[PDB]
Design a protein around this ligand. Structure first.
Ligand SMILES: *Cc1cc2c(cc1C)nc1c(=O)[nH]c(=O)nc-1n2C[C@H](O)[C@H](O)[C@H](O)COP(=O)(O)OP(=O)(O)OC[C@H]1O[C@@H](n2cnc3c(N)ncnc32)[C@H](O)[C@@H]1O
Ligand SMILES: C/C=C/CC/C=C/CC/C=C/CCCCCCC(=O)OC[C@H](COP(=O)(O)OCCN)OC(=O)CCCCCCC/C=C/C/C=C/CCC
Ligand code: HEM
Ligand SMILES: O=C(Nc1cccc(Oc2ccccc2)c1)c1ccccc1C(F)(F)F
Ligand code: SF4
Ligand code: F3S
Ligand code: FES
Lengths: 239, 613, 102, 138
């Protein structure tokens, strides 16, 4: 037998006058998968079926299980459990978010921000669409690498201290990188207008290069660098 | 009932599902001017199609000169002549227009020297109607094409005023006198119940891969729409046809794309010999998915396993150039390293045939209309549609071709929207549902919320998953299947004994997973019972006691002077399954496959022949 | 479609490199002409800096307008004070020079 | 439902509910980049407080600068304590100066990877100590 302890943030909205608290669970690692989601599923299935969390793909491309593990925002299905038994895994919801229940945060604001940057291809003349494939060279396509792979797990934005204090008016890492994703896409014709949508003190300019976003992104992406690249476009674009 | 709030909504159309099919249909309806609702238990991006890795097939002819009819032939041949050719005609012809559409939506397809969409070789595809060698028509966004497909479709969806009921669990269909009126659903956020009524309903809930212990499919593939059709007394189709993808990781069961083999990847047994060159001389390890995994399962059985347990096989990739792997397969390179600790450019990946795709589902027109079966004849269910993995237009039949479902999604999602847009107009009378309608679903919900029994949900789920995995795997026989049937039936009797713990209204995952269990069982019963009744080897369904392929004729010899077998004497027919929800007994019937295409002159019918690659 | 948000940002980096160039320039060439430039650069850079701190923490339209006014005054007094020092007293460059050989 | 409407409904939902905010500063693990961002603020604020106090006292307080220097030599102590006064002034200046250069290099789009952050972070930290010892000894 090989026991590992898990301290997990718990809050029930249906329980009268219940405040946020931590609960510990004991798990034999000889009977559990290597990843933290496996643990959460195991304690759900065997110990406590009250532990509520989001999950789906189990392979790290849906971004459902995004949560704070040991002080860092990642995906539970990709983070392997620290086989160090003397240490206790601390599991929290995504930082500075309204807790619906247990580890399930309200992401509807996050999604709404994504909606407001219009994350779809826009052409000046759209009467020809659907009958001929648009041409994009191998180099023009490479520009998208590192940007399109985004999962919208929200780890980065939820790690950004600017997004903590100003998440209402500041779009954050994830959404901003996606605005950049459409900016340098060669097929898009709304580069100038997309930039102008960020011409206020909050939308883009609440980034102060803290760089917590890049350091936490479970997919290895670099939103901070893209934000830096947006800022350079804002200062250089004409008309 | 005075302890549950009921909120009634009114729409022109409801789409249940937010995957490829679900989205494409949803905004397709709104584009046509319909006030549409979209009901999904997950955020649209979290949907399984995001996991898709290989590609989407279209005969665009970017690598070599191609014809869509060649794609038609390959699909029907792969379907082992259980595929309905009217629906296959429609899909393959539309394929180029559907993929061009996606690229025009903004999908970031990988590119060529010409700037056109990069296509690649994939299992089961050929040029010149089989004669002209390997085909390259698998359009892809590197290794993350399903991810890109879902993200651009969702991206596009925001351009319209569709109402998205995010994280809403559909319980049952609102059904009145055979006609569909919408859906009753649970709002996960606050526990409230929502009757969403419409003139037309589209079911795009995807597959039920979670009936088994080992599957590439997500935790959320629980065949919920399949069970909704079942509880309505309507039939499901070909549910015993479960695709085992050859290349799934030995660990968690994660998928490794067929694109690996399409780019030059090889399968290797314990002795090192390229074993797939023996089973398939012409196509090799790039053969049909029912045949490749059949051989892999066979290799383990004669002691050629590749581990300390001798229970798997290797997928070699290290011979391919490092710069090729990084561009064509960045996705699997990461997941192989994460789940198996494998560097793909040096060491092979441990792979094993695991449950993947469900070609069975809700029987359907080439137009996407759900079919009931009355008096041995087909009949359209008024105001009920289905598309995607959840449906069964049987465009895949007995065995699905790789990279055809992402197409199946985009084509028939669009078709559902078009069939509605052409049969009625937005603002037409939304039919009036009964004041007490959907009462059984709320009562079912309430019974499961306070369920204090003796068998935990997870324990009963595991019992079902392990039972299906050992009784209904790659190879199956009458006796093993029959023991499986009376074991799954006994487990349905255990559904009155289940124990639940969470008694809250907000985000009761304990409850929804128990709802998912009721759904999975209904899918399991119909899969296993239909499987045992079918006494032939066709596609993914292989009977060792019935090795032969049983058609109306013996198609190995000439058709000239032969006596045609009666309908109830052969097996080239669709399985239609029903289950009485109370007792849990399975009664089954059969309907004919459609051989005639939409136009003989433009696309000729392909009669049955010897099936081998 | 005015672009003030991006201009302000560019303005910030412009006075940043200016102030960076000035510090050694003041060391190498300590004169009256450098004392006023240093007063202009120090005050402006600081004024915009605290401006960012205010826009980050001071929540509410009523309070933020007030904090920006209180900062404007504080910056106005600062630049006047330095210029007064440069005109009537020994000047920034010479003042640092005296203080350091103590 | 528009993006603007969803945000307006999000904030109405949560502020009128018993939903608790998930912990942020109490749980998130520390890092050098983040700690150096906090110090850049502190050093910035501290320096502005200095420049303002120096200018404000020139307008509001009596006497000249020469007079105020003679006032420091009152109950004064050894050169070691004078070295401490100079180090206490020059330290936050040097830090903010070097880290500011790093900020400017970032704005050009360079050095923005996790390994490069830790490197340039240490380089700034080392350059601060050296230029703070070097200037206080002049
Ligand atoms: C498993 C898999 C499949 C797959 C693949 C890789 C993996 C790991 N790669 C493929 C590929 O490269 N090329 C290809 O052609 N196919 C590939 N596949 C198969 C294919 O992707 C799937 O069959 C297809 O994605 C199915 O998509 P579909 O549009 O039918 O929807 P879904 O992805 O399964 O998601 C289901 C949606 O329905 C909603 N839902 C389900 N139940 C409910 C209830 N209870 N109430 C409300 N909504 C419900 C889900 O929310 C989800 O949005
Ligand atoms: C508000 C201003 C308040 C003043 C206090 C802050 C100044 C500290 C700056 C540290 C520089 C130390 C230089 C040591 C020195 O003797 O001056 C340089 C030397 C060079 O030659 P020298 O010693 O004079 O002799 C040779 C040539 N003169 O002496 C000089 O020439 C003086 C030039 C210094 C100019 C730098 C001004 C920077 C102000 C920063 C404000 C930060 C406030 C906190
Ligand atoms: C010549 C050396 C200096 C350089 C290169 C420099 C550069 C910078 C830069 C680039 C920033 C913006 C950092 C960001 O993007 O968040 C900044 C912030 C700031 N600076 Fe300086 N600066 C210097 C000296 C000073 C001085 C002497 C003062 C005192 C008035 C000062 C006060 C401030 C303040 C208050 C901020 C805002 C703090 C923040 O928002 O994080 N700086 N500096
Ligand atoms: O205060 C800032 N960071 C900050 C403020 C408080 C806490 C924090 O995290 C932690 C979290 C845990 C431990 C330590 C620091 C970060 C900050 C610094 C420079 C520029 C802009 C900011 C600001 F945007 F305003 F957020
Ligand atoms: S950039 Fe990374 S952390 Fe941010 S949403 Fe995308 S995958 Fe998640
Ligand atoms: S964590 Fe932050 S403030 Fe900018 S660099 Fe990343 S968004
Ligand atoms: S659950 Fe799909 S990302 Fe972890």
């Amino acid at each position: 037998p090989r026991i590992k302890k898990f301290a997990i943030y718990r809050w029930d909205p249906d329980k009268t006058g219940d405040k946020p608290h931590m609960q510990t669970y004991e798990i034999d690692l000889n009977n559990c998968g290597p990843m933290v989601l496996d643990a959460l599923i195991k304690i759900k299935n065997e110990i406590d079926s009250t532990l509520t969390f989001r999950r789906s793909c189990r392979e790290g491309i849906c971004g459902s299980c995004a949560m704070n593990i040991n002080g860092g925002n990642t995906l539970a299905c990709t983070r392997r459990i620290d086989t160090n038994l003397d240490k206790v895994s601390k599991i929290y919801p995504l930082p500075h978010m309204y807790v619906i229940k247990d580890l399930v945060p309200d992401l509807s604001n996050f999604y709404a921000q994504y909606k407001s940057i219009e994350p779809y291809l826009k052409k000046k003349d759209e009467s020809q669409e659907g009958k001929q494939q648009y041409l994009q060279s191998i180099e023009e396509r490479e520009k998208l690498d590192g940007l399109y792979e985004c999962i919208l797990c929200a780890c980065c934005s939820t790690s950004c201290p600017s997004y903590w204090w100003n998440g209402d008016k500041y779009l954050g890492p994830a959404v901003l990188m996606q605005a950049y994703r459409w900016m340098i896409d060669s097929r898009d014709d709304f580069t100038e207008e997309r930039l102008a949508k960020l011409q206020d003190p909050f939308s883009l300019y609440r980034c102060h290069t803290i760089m917590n976003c890049t350091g936490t992104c479970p997919k290895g992406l670099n939103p901070g660098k893209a934000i830096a690249e947006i800022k350079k476009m804002m200062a250089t674009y004409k008309e | 009932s005075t302890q549950y709030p009921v909120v009634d909504h009114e729409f022109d159309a409801v789409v249940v599902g937010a995957g490829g099919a679900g989205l494409r249909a949803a905004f397709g309806l709104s584009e046509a001017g319909f006030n549409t609702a979209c009901v999904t238990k997950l955020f649209p991006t979290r949907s399984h199609t995001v996991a898709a890795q290989g590609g989407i097939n279209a005969a665009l002819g970017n690598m070599e000169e191609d014809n869509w009819r060649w794609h038609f032939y390959d699909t029907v041949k792969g379907s082992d002549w259980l595929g309905d050719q009217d629906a296959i005609h429609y899909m393959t012809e539309q394929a180029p227009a559907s993929v061009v559409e996606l690229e025009n939506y903004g999908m970031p397809f990988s590119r060529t020297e010409d700037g056109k969409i990069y296509q690649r070789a994939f299992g089961g595809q050929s040029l010149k109607f089989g004669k002209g060698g390997q085909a390259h028509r698998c359009c892809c966004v590197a290794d993350r094409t399903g991810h890109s497909l879902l993200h651009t479709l969702y991206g596009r969806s925001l351009r319209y005023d569709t109402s998205y009921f995010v994280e809403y669990f559909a319980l049952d269909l609102l059904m009145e006198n055979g006609e569909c009126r919408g859906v009753i659903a649970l709002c996960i956020e606050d526990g409230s119940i929502h009757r969403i009524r419409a003139r037309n309903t589209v079911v795009a809930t995807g597959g039920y891969g979670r009936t088994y212990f080992s599957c590439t499919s997500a935790h959320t593939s629980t065949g919920d729409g399949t069970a909704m059709v079942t509880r309505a007394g309507l039939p499901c189709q070909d549910l015993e046809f479960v695709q085992f993808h050859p290349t799934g990781i030995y660990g968690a069961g994660c998928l490794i794309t067929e694109g690996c083999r399409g780019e030059g990847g090889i399968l290797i047994n314990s002795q090192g010999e390229r074993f797939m060159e023996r089973y398939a001389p012409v196509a090799k390890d790039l053969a049909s998915r029912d045949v490749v995994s059949r051989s892999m399962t066979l290799e383990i059985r004669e002691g050629r396993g590749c581990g300390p347990e001798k229970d798997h096989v290797y997928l070699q990739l290290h011979h391919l150039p490092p710069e090729q792997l990084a561009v064509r397969l960045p996705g699997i390179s990461e997941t192989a390293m994460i789940f198996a600790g494998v560097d793909v450019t040096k060491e092979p990946i441990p792979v094993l045939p695991t449950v993947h795709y469900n070609m069975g589902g809700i029987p359907t027109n080439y137009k996407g209309q759900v079919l009931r079966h009355v008096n041995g004849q087909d009949q359209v269910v008024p105001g009920l549609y289905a598309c995607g993995e959840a449906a069964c237009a049987s465009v895949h039949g007995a065995n699905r071709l790789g990279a055809n479902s992402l197409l199946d999604l985009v084509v028939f999602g669009r078709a559902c929207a078009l069939s509605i847009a052409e049969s009625c107009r937005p603002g037409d009378k939304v039919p009036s549902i009964k004041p007490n309608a959907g009462e059984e679903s709320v009562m079912n919900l309430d019974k499961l919320r306070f369920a204090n029994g003796t068998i935990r949900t997870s324990e009963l789920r595991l019992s079902m998953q392990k039972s299906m995995q050992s009784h209904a795997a790659v190879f199956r026989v009458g006796s093993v299947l029959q023991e499986g049937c009376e074991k799954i039936l006994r487990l349905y009797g255990d559904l009155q004994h289940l124990k639940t713990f969470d008694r809250g209204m907000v985000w009761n995952t304990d409850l929804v997973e128990t709802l998912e269990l009721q759904n999975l069982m209904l899918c399991a019963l119909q899969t296993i019972y239909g499987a045992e009744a079918r006494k032939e080897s066709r596609g993914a369904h292989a009977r060792e006691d019935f090795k032969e392929r049983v058609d109306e004729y013996d198609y190995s010899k000439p058709i000239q002077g032969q006596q045609k077998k009666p309908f109830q004497e052969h097996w080239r027919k669709h399985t239609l399954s029903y289950v009485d929800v109370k007792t849990g007994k399975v009664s089954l019937e059969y309907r004919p496959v459609i051989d005639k295409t939409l136009n003989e002159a433009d696309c000729a019918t392909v009669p049955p022949a010897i099936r081998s690659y | 479609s005015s672009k003030a948000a991006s201009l302000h940002w560019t303005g910030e980096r412009v006075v940043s490199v200016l102030l960076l160039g000035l510090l050694p320039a003041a060391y190498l060439n300590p004169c009256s002409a450098m004392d006023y430039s240093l007063a202009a650069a120090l005050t402006l850079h600081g004024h915009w800096g605290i401006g960012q701190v205010v826009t980050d923490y001071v929540r509410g339209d009523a309070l933020q307008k007030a904090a920006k006014a209180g900062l404007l005054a504080l910056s106005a007094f600062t630049f006047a004070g330095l210029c007064y020092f440069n005109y009537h007293d020994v000047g920034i460059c010479k003042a640092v020079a005296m203080l350091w050989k103590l | 439902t528009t993006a603007k409407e969803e945000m307006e409904r999000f904030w109405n939902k949560n502020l009128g509910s018993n939903r608790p905010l998930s912990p942020h500063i109490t749980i998130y693990r520390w890092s050098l980049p983040m700690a150096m961002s906090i110090c850049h603020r502190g050093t910035g604020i501290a320096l502005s407080a200095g420049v303002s106090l120096f200018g404000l006292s020139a307008l509001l307080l009596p006497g000249n600068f020469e007079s105020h220097l003679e006032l420091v030599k009152s109950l004064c102590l050894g050169p070691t304590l004078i070295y401490t006064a100079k180090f206490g002034i020059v330290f936050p200046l040097m830090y903010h100066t070097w880290n500011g250069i790093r900020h400017l290099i970032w704005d050009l789009g360079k050095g923005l990877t996790i390994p490069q952050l830790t490197q340039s972070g240490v380089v700034v930290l080392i350059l601060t100590v050296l230029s703070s010892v070097g200037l206080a000894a002049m």
